[PDB]
Design a protein around this ligand. Sequence first.
Ligand SMILES: OC[C@H]1O[C@H](O)[C@H](O)[C@@H](O)[C@@H]1O
Ligand SMILES: [Br-]
Ligand SMILES: [Br-]
Ligand SMILES: [Br-]
Ligand SMILES: [Br-]
Length: 715
Amino acid sequence: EKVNEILSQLTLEEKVKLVVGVGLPGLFGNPHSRVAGAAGETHPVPRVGLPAFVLADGPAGLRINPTRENDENTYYTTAFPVEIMLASTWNRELLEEVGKAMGEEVREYGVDVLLAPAMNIHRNPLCGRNFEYYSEDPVLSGEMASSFVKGVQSQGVGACIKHFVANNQETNRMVVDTIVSERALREIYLRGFEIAVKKSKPWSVMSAYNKLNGKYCSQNEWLLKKVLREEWGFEGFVMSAWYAGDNPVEQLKAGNDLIMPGKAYQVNTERRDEIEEIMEALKEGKLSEEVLDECVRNILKVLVNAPSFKNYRYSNKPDLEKHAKVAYEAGAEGVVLLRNEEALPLSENSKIALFGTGQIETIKGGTGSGDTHPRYAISILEGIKERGLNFDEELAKTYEDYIKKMRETEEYKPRRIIKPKLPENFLSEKEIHKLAKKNDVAVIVISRISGEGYDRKPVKGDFYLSDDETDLIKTVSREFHEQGKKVIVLLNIGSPVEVVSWRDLVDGILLVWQAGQETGRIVADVLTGRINPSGKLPTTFPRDYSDVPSWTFPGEPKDNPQKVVYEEDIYVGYRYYDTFGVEPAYEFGYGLSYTTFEYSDLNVSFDGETLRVQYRIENTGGRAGKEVSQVYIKAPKGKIDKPFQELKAFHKTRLLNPGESEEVVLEIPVRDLASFNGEEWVVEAGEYEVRVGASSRNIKLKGTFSVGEERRFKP
Ligand SMILES: OC[C@H]1O[C@H](O)[C@H](O)[C@@H](O)[C@@H]1O
Ligand SMILES: [Br-]
Ligand SMILES: [Br-]
Ligand SMILES: [Br-]
Ligand SMILES: [Br-]
């Protein structure tokens, strides 16, 4: 009743103020948000008891200013592992915990809505923001997102799933027209958002920068209204990506309730003030008051539940120590062991020769709106020191000295905030020979960073190893292998890189991604086996970039794309590699363990409305560990073309001791089995195959069931 009451009290002008942000806080002419560093604020209306609501990034943790002027207090937040690493956990419960921790910091720092999680599909590994997205698969993505949203919103604050939809490249994102069939949309790109919307009920959705089939997402009625609302039954409000679109009136008409951050003229001289443009449109009858009321109601019906609406006295003192444990745990389960030829874990007291500048310049996460400002960030070297591991102390000082020297130099000093990539081959061929005799093992850090606004390139030093990185690995490998010793590589990266050319040169490979503030601790602990790797890939690692099915990336013309066509359609990520027989370097769902697991006791039953899959996993190794199991369904060929198989469920065991087992029981609604034929979802009659895998290509148990009667669903 409150909402309809406030609504009835508002004047036309106050209503317009409410659907437009107050401008980017603390930049240009604008005052700081009462939470300094926050991404945006709504217009207050004291008249009718509406406060300003505060919105802030981001996916890796709350992003606000750590300090404030005329203030002795401190406002640090927890920097969690990046989303691609969180997805690697394949652990819903854990993602929910990460949401709660973040949510407590959101609430207690006076924020009302967290601008997370990001959940665009990994269409192409070069997308600059892949690090802060979950997966190339909509079920993994949707399920991780749902868990995170539930976590955040258990804390009395709102989540915001973004970016809706098909924002799968950074190049010309604010302008590019994304051409995608309705089938690709419904099966791949819309699909994760559908799951999140239906299962977790996020307070808000952020419409994407890009056009979708001719229309800006922020101004796309089919997207924000027919699909989101009418079909899916979304009950929240939609906000625009910052400065997205070109027409505030079209945005409101489309179902984009909240225009952020407001004052677009401050960034684009050709935009009018949106309040003035809207007021004029109302005056002229270009926009009806009824549409305006709907947008305002969508906003209030959600935000009357925000802490700010009840004048919540936030503490400015969240439990950072408790949240750090959660960040460490998330990182611990998200590391992916890609290769282990009797190399890991390291023996106790093993003397480590630590290589690569990334050991010191460790990447905690990518740049942009999804960045964070934690009190600390434990480098790989620091974590190893902290845990008291036996490392070459002379070498570590050499690296420290070399980085200082290089970063002080003109060519490599941080510019404007990028740090030029350092040469990694500064050690002499004889210096490394000395290292091989002195130490027991080699550990080489390979680091990459990416971020909002920039796409990566299929070139050396980016997707490919730079020549100096290749030379370092070759030399270290040769030297240490001659001495009978093992070499380990740590991939401190945010998205796939080439691995085929060098992986056979080394014995161990740990994909440690970018693990936030606790990175070095997580990494050290994985090396010694205190952590048993349980992460599995949420995205495909291709042998070569030319293998990638999304070849049109980043569009036409390449250097200034006005449009990009998803030629590969539904056949993206593993759906492509499986269906057309292209072998990846490492497949979707792949990941090793320090122990072994045996799958057994498969039972499959379909009562016509629910597919029930049960099996048993036993730890047959000598170290406790968790196992991620994946259930792929292979639908019959029947009427329409379909991928080879599709992930429909997944699970992760508790921490099993040697000899322990766990019974897995998963249920899949019949509707989930459907393919979209362009008009409707269809679950074709026929024999289906259940494929329970330790990865999409390591199937451990197979069974079948039959659909007797075709089922159809209109969107
Ligand atoms: O920082 C506010 C927003 O700015 C941009 O729209 C980013 O794409 C979005 O992810 C972020 O939440
Ligand atoms: Br997407
Ligand atoms: Br391998
Ligand atoms: Br990266
Ligand atoms: Br194209």
